[PDB]
């Protein structure tokens, strides 16, 4: 996030970190329940990747983070890689996440929910702060 | 390929088609042996995707194509999704490909092989012919 | 990539308005936000864009694509969750 600000540790408990086996963060993702995380299909997740929850500082070793393994990757069959349309994938954790103060779910909208232009929302993640 | 030309059917026998379960071609890939296909890591392949070999015309139903299933996806652990660096993934077919006149392997280079600027190579695939 | 989690509030845009920046690449399953002096960037992909509705934070978008230099005056493109949620329901129920 460019021009963002540091968040309060654990104030976005559904935010997870997608990291490959080398410990490299490559994509964010959101916990929708204790066995399911939602991410972008373009992230190209595989079962060797790991889902990290309860994390705030990637450089800290004193955090009670949860390193969850992925049982199965569910790439939306409508995902169009040429246009990056319908960019959503569901990951089913083999290890069910334990919810707490810093680990919980975001709410999913009804297909009918309207989110008006002008409405202030928010976005999070550990992506570049400047290109 | 923009400004390309139609190839001779089966003249690039290692070229495979990566298609999701809806029958949609989303990436190409090259057969390196009867159990291994090489593709781009960014293609974000999963085990539900299918590898098609022996295909020339996607719109033809009279082709003896080989629809191979993927046993395991091997995303290069060096693959950097932020920069798209080290963009290679290996797919291990659960169904070994049968080689023939139209299905065979491309040769892999020695890590020491030099390919000089100016050298005319060639590229294939079923990607857009015009944007 | 920064070590500690970043955040930024940003406004939603209509697809029509977004078309002015991105033309035809914007599909009905996409939803724009930003162009506000703030911008999602490489590494954020897959993350959330949430809006508060009735007290609760609701997943409205999934960080997807946008400007290659993450310029803060151009809108980032997110996957529109409303158009994908039915698929999500079907998948959870079946697995």
């Amino acid at each position: 996030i460019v021009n963002g600000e540091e968040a309060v540790p654990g104030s976005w408990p559904w935010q997870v970190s997608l990291q490959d086996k080398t410990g490299f963060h490559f994509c964010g993702g959101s916990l929708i329940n204790e066995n399911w995380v939602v991410t972008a299909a373009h992230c190209g997740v595989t079962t060797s990747d790991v889902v990290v929850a309860g994390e705030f500082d990637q450089g800290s070793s004193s955090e009670k983070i949860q390193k969850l393994k992925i049982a199965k990757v569910f790439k939306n069959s409508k995902y169009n890689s040429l246009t990056i349309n319908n960019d959503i994938t569901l990951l089913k954790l083999s290890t069910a996440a334990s919810f707490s103060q810093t680990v919980s779910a975001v709410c999913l909208p009804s297909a009918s929910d309207d989110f008006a232009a002008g409405t202030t929302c928010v976005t999070t993640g550990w992506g570049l702060t400047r290109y | 390929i923009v400004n390309g030309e139609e190839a001779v059917p089966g003249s690039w026998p290692w070229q495979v088609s990566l298609q999701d379960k809806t029958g949609f071609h989303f990436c190409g890939g090259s057969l390196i042996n009867e159990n291994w296909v090489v593709t781009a890591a960014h293609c974000g392949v999963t085990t539900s995707d299918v590898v098609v070999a022996g295909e020339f015309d996607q719109g033809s139903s009279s082709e003896k194509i080989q629809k191979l299933k993927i046993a395991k996806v091997f995303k290069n652990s060096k693959y950097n999704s932020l920069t798209i660096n080290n963009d290679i993934t290996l797919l291990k077919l659960s169904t070994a490909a049968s080689f023939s006149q139209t299905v065979s392997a491309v040769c892999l280079p020695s890590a020491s092989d030099d390919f000089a600027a100016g050298t005319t190579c060639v590229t294939t695939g079923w990607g857009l012919t015009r944007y | 990539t920064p070590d500690r989690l970043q955040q930024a509030s940003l406004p939603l845009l209509s697809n029509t308005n977004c078309k002015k920046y991105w033309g035809t690449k914007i599909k009905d399953a996409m939803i724009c936000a930003g162009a506000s002096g703030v911008s999602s960037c490489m590494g954020d992909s897959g993350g959330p864009l949430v809006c508060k509705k009735n007290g609760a934070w609701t997943l409205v978008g999934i960080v997807s694509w946008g400007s290659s230099t993450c310029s803060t005056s151009t809108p980032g493109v997110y996957a529109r969750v409303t158009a994908l949620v039915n698929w999500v329901q079907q998948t959870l129920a079946a697995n």
């Binding site: 990056i84 992506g127 | - | 991105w22 992909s45 960080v63 946008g66």
Partner: peptide, 5 residues
């Protein structure tokens, strides 16, 4: 553009 990502 560019994938985010």
């Amino acid at each position: 553009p560019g994938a985010y990502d």
